[model samples]
Target chain A: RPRFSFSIAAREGKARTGTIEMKRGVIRTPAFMPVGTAATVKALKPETVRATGADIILGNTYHLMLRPGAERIAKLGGLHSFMGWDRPILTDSGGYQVMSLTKQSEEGVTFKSHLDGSRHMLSPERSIEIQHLLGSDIVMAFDECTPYPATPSRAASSMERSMRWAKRSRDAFDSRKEQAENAALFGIQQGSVFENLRQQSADALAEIGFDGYAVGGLAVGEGQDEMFRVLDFSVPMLPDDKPHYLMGDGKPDDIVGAVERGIDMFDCVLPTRRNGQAFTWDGPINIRNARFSEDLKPLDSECHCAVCQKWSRAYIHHLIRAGEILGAMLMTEHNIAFYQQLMQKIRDSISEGRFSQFAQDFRARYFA
Target chain B: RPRFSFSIAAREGKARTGTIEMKRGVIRTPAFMPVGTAATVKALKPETVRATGADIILGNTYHLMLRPGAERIAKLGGLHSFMGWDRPILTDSGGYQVMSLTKQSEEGVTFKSHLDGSRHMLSPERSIEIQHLLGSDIVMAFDECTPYPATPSRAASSMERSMRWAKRSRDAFDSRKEQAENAALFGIQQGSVFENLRQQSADALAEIGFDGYAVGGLAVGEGQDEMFRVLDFSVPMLPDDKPHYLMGDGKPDDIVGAVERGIDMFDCVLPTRRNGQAFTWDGPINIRNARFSEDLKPLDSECHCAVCQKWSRAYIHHLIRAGEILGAMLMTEHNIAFYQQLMQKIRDSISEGRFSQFAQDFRARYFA
Candidate 1:
């Protein structure tokens, strides 16, 4: 196998099922990348994350660069050895988060870290360098974000700025010969509120050339219905052969809708948070509810995750009521596995050319 | 294969090695039982606890009664089914912890709940009934405790009260014919800070006839040296054919010292505490220490635990510093396994008749 290669196995409508092969491992798309902010998939062991069928996990370069620092991670044998996850890790550029608090310039953005109010800069060049230091398998390009409720003109300006940064990120990424040879760079298409801006951003990303393109800036409080409208137009604008990532997306239906629109990758914190908060296709059930006091059934009777297989809802309820960490652990474990199962079904449905039918059925049960 | 049985396999002087056979499973001794207060071993899953080589765990009857309630656990299929541990669980009678705040009575004691200020009473009969409801394999007797620094007269009065309660617990236990058929009741030898009182307590317990005995009231504020002095006289007074349990007992050295003085079973919160606080034969090290930020070694290089097999000290250090649960999870997993290994070595040494030499070398590195 080559250092990086993506193969599409099947397609259902615009929805594509494929595998992204890399030196680290092969990631099956459309994959549900679990969040490992600060180099850890919260409350889960690396092997357990693998056990949940996660081919790869998403890390935040913003969080890592602030706390453990990328240089320290490189000294400790990169993120793989530092965190004990040998599989491919895709780290987002420190752009989207930093935009929330910053002193902007053409050179880069300067921001005070939420951790200790320590000032830091993350340019397109710097972001690529940090990813190299962390030995990221898939490095995201640094791009300015279009915040929700932006005017068409404001969205266009932000989209154009991101296009320029994408080029810079691509140049700096390719300059690192060793890292460039082993890893893949992904460009973020930042035109959430305007389809015209999205086409321009998508056209610019292709000029610089990236292994993947992400439909970014949509998950930032734009509402699910609004996100789908933009995704419908923006997804088709990206290169057909490259994998399409729907950044920071979404509820179960949101993901299904995105995949239906040709997205190949998705990552969110809902599953990790859902572990304790509790989320299932049957809808969210607070484990702390007194109704679950005598419910001897599993969290979800149909689910085959380890927590559901061996533990009863009553037991988890008791643990939650008592505020035990084991409850969160079991909940998180089951939730991660649940998300993986959802993605597997989505892939299976796409491969079988019945994704539309599967999406409708899933929506019926999920919304029930 | 029996419902309940204990057989000694080997002995080096007074120290012994054995197994406690029950319908649940066989528990090897000298065993280090992990504390699962509120039906959880803190951050561990039931299976993970088993992975640590633990055959049995200790549950607090008080914590269970207050939060989830023993009745609810029974309705949901008992503690074994609720907590997902099919192996043996030894539940401490709600005695040791309750003495801190209570109104004394000949029949039992009334106390305000620490969780809420609700009033409750725990008679020997009630405690015994709660254990049966929880479906405990090893049920400890409800005994009055001798608090540390108590005068000889105060200790004597407490010891006498516990003896009466022991008989009450015994009668209540045997009264439940079906539960008694499967469960084993253990008497606590309370008479700490006094030799004659322990002998009297031991004598009264034997007359009542429990399946096993525990040396209680030593791990309080009494120094280790004082505990050994009392154990020397107290242990000889108990029946030699049954298992000897050292209740609420201690550090690595403390367990070693107690086991050397003929204790067959031990339980502690030390290993569970050690996960974040960190502990090994090399003594305690805080995972939050900055020095470990780049120390790319395992918590203990010799440790064969899952955490040590892959995770670097730097990763755990970052996790602890960041206040992530994964740090505690990994640390706790390793700590529990470390404790289990210590117990295994202790048992091995006793069986091989080299326990004395093993203890000397262990203390050398451990204390160094």
Candidate 2:
């Protein structure tokens, strides 16, 4: 019960503006946390990410625990000081990656390191411990992210196992009273595409209790319509007072859809890794296209980022075509800035009670 | 000569402090220009390069002409506006690249484009025209960069041909009277390691007369001893009143030695291309070394650059080890800043008449 506070400021339909007040900083919602998978947000500096209006970044427990290891990061004074990012950081539990990249057993998950082939194990308790050691502001409860299209029985079994693991993670987090005092732990609900299983999973998590709740398995290759469908059934099942995070679900439209369904938090790597992609009010444009060879226009005419202010499409096209790193650097910078701006716009529209109109106009223009 | 002005600020033996005034910007000497091969400085943005204290950057006629095509760049805006760099840009004549990447002929050089297999010819007039069209602040005359270990006759023949090209370049440059009024043309001396051929080459260039002179062909593969030996005689043969640039010469020590021997400007890929390499007051250090994994020191103990002021060697080591793009970005940023700071130190030391002592102490500590 001793955790940071989360409060809603304004709302329009299901979409709301709020803040998760933490010791390091306050993350304004619906906020987008840029993915810093390996203690880095790929091409961007921490300060650059901060400058893009990100209050927090999402680091991967799986990646950090493998190469530089959680112990190493902890010894170096936690991920914040180690990575030179003093802002709040939300580190995902190792469950998602272990299922994707390694072998999973009923007792725990055994993973081969992505950097090397070294073996490692991650249980619910171990996951919570790693996040504790890394000094995460928001630690995630470990859960099996049930794959899409599973049988109803398989989804139920997976959901029940995750509920047990959630209890283990919560108990492990609670054991560290001092860390628990400053940090908040979020429970993840995973039940493939079954609405009944999703409801059961959410109800179980509510029974056990967590500072926050995450809706997982929706964005796992399920189409946006199906994902939005799942969100409609699953989101309202979680406790309304707690923050609701949509894990790895997005594009700009997907984010808007999730926000509309009441997701308070989100994280993704697309904004950082989409090859030479630049986002605008219209949508994503690949700067590598030939039409931009002599196009002297900024990446986004409607945008006001430093990249847009200073560079032209022609130059970015040249850098991308030539395979220069600056192209990726500049392109990623603009995309992240666009995402930040998108979140800001979402929050503002929600606060002003114009979110419905905003969402309508965004989808029409961006999808066109 | 119709060119930019060059005036000495202070002198100490052969080393002197000076400034090269151009229409775009003034370049402080002895200056180190980072190589921006394809209009982009590899991993750094133009603003980042400028923040590193760089007065100018050197672009390749070969790479730019091959890919973006000077005509395409000119269509959008010249290099300055296209690259978003308002500072002075010195463009190397395609001679060096053409000789290495393409077929050589008596009339000119015919090289296959590195990007595509398309063949292109680089005559002195054509090279000058490309630089003019690209809006170069300082245009270099086309000359063959003589190979090391050539016979005296081979060196002399190469020098004579370069001299002939120098005249053609001068004539072509003079034809563009309006561009010539604002821009400066520099002649290159290429006689391998032969002093008499260099003297004859210098005499021929003087007769044709250009704005500045560059001692080329020494840094190719020749050892440091051989390079300094050539600079001893060849640099003195160039016109004393104009700025003298040393092409592609060196490590920090090499630059120090050349500055001691009266070189006012230099350009090389070493400072920009060396992986994880950072120049320090003590010397160059590769940040990829294993010992820095947990060593939480700045890349350079004495460097005042933002990278140093913020990041740790351990974090940089992790980046380099992970083969991240930010590794190259931050490393190049610090190296360029160190080079700029080194140049400033050199200018300051010469102005105060302590350059000899400064050079002596630097070599002792760096080499140790």
Candidate 3:
């Protein structure tokens, strides 16, 4: 009904290059949104994030609301000015965390405050409200993320409740005149691994309608193959005019696989979280391994990040062996840079209509 | 008599800009050496250190011997290749640490290794051998750093013994044919806070001779006035042709004051260590404070370091508050860059023959 548009610039096999034009900014599809948990992307500075070519970052409503308190952030200003990053931010509604923290409840999940351990009830309306308060650009609707191996009955009940919540979320979002005018709300579909429940959830979401659609519950350990099977049919069921997001799913291969199945946006903690593990993931060079002790080459011979340009592998190995935290930070920087570059390559290939060649080449080289 | 040369380019009261041409390199006076304590500078990538404009860095001989071992570093290459720092390195013999770890003895001190608590005897000759093995550019002649408040007898006895050790250090250093080819020894003049004992120590070292002289007995808990009182007269007694070095003395104010009293080179852990405390020495700003939580400015408006240029105070504040080690590393990078900048500015002012105006202006502004 709205003047909605989605067009491909180029296509290579199933991979297609395109732009998702929105009211705020043009989101290049297959974009990687840096994860900004607790209103920060770990140690990175905002401009540093910008330099990494991030058009937007993902923020968590649950964490931000619990600590600095979402109300406090809203009272001061929106999260943009508060955190000093002004481009765009996508905040997940407090629902997933509600499920994560609360033991399953029948009427509604009582999500306990991580800071004070106080009880608070979360439903679709409250989730939408919190996202509004945080001033997120791409707001996610509230829904239960059905855990892995969920039974048909459990999936059915959860999916039905989520559908009811989605209506409430849509209504709540529609009521917010200021937020609705500037931001787009995406609906999340969850039915665990059940194909019937997934179809039901997607169809229900399509009927109510949303600015965007997200396929959830797949990467919650259902495995990529199973997630792919669900995605193949489920993706086509949603309106193709809006953006399609795969929420809380990934690994490099997971991302590559999902994109092939028609996912447009992804945000994950893998690149940042793996920093603490001191794994330098650049074409499979492990800087911490003994083989690098005398190697003078940079972590990646091709990386243009300052770390690669100025440092040697032996130096990183020394810091890692000595348990210096700087080693972790630099390595993390490299990995994140690699991921962003990977996203750029994906987007470029899609635009050039050569995504198949690029994907095959990448797997062959890195896996070799 | 060993071709000692110094060129003083600028002077304000007693402070001056100058250069000291030793066997290894021509050092710009008023330099701040980054502390690389264990053959490596803790968490930093060596290239990052170099990029900060460091021409020389300080290494602590004590920590290197225990883990990785000096012999191992020698077997691999020299300290430069081993640590990935190609610049000049000045090492402090285990002398100060020996005094801290052991009880007084007749032959030599019995100090327990900090890493394992295993005992080892540290004498001037062995200490010299360790530094020589590490392939330092500037080696400290082994001497006891007597704890403060010792009786005159205690001070004189320790000073005279250090004088004897200074000779042995010179002898052992002279014994390393390859190390002696380019390395130069700097004698540590230690006499606590007393002028006469310091005079005696300086005279003894002058009689024995060294490439440089370091006034090493302050910055311990001695208030600034007492430290200045000692440096006011003591710094002048060393050979003017050789560089006047001050070991382990400072804050920004301390460095400014010591430079005013004619100390040429200095080193401290203040800048990097302060990073972990979340109190960076950028003028007087504390990034961890609530005021910075919403402040969008960089760490220092004047700093050219990567952190300041690319990160906001709010971003750094969030990282520190969340206990991310990247916060520490990034801040450390900024602080060191600041210190190096100060040193470079001082050196430039001296070279331009405008040191007096620069020092007075800096002191009036910084302390105010």
lDDT (10s digit) by residue, model 2, range A20-112:
889898899999999988888988888889988999999888989986889988888889988889989999998888777666677778877
Query: 2 or 3, which is superior by DockQ?
Result: 2
iRMSD for each candidate structure, in the order shown: 0.9, 0.9, 4.0
Q: Per-residue alpha-carbon lDDT of model 1 for A1-368, expressed as tens digits?
A: 57888899999889999999999889999999999998899888888999989999988889999989999999888999888899999999989878754789888899999999999989999999999999999999998887888998888888888888999999999999998899999999987678788898899998889999998898899798888899889999999999999988477778889999999999988878733466677876788888888988888867778888888888888877777777878888888888888899999999898989999998888888
Once fitted onto the true fold, the runs of candidate 1 whose alpha carbons sit more than 4 angstroms away are none
| Residue-level lDDT tens digits of model 2 in B1-368 | 22488999999999989898877788899999999998988888888999999999999898889978988888877999998889889999988887777567767888777667898989898999999888998999999888877888888888889999999999999989977788889999888998788889899999889899999888788899999999999888999999999988488999999999999998879888837777777777788888888988898898889989988899888888888888888888998898898899999999999999999998998888
Candidate 3 per-residue lDDT over residues B120-209, each given as its tens digit: 776777777888778888889888777777788988888888888889888888887866767888998989889999899889999988
Per-candidate TM-scores read: 0.98, 0.98, 0.85
Worst lDDT run of 10 residues, candidate 3 chain A, spans: A274-283
lDDT of each: 0.88, 0.88, 0.76
* Candidate 2 TM-score to native: 0.98
The Cα error of candidate 1 at residue B139, in Å, is 0.5
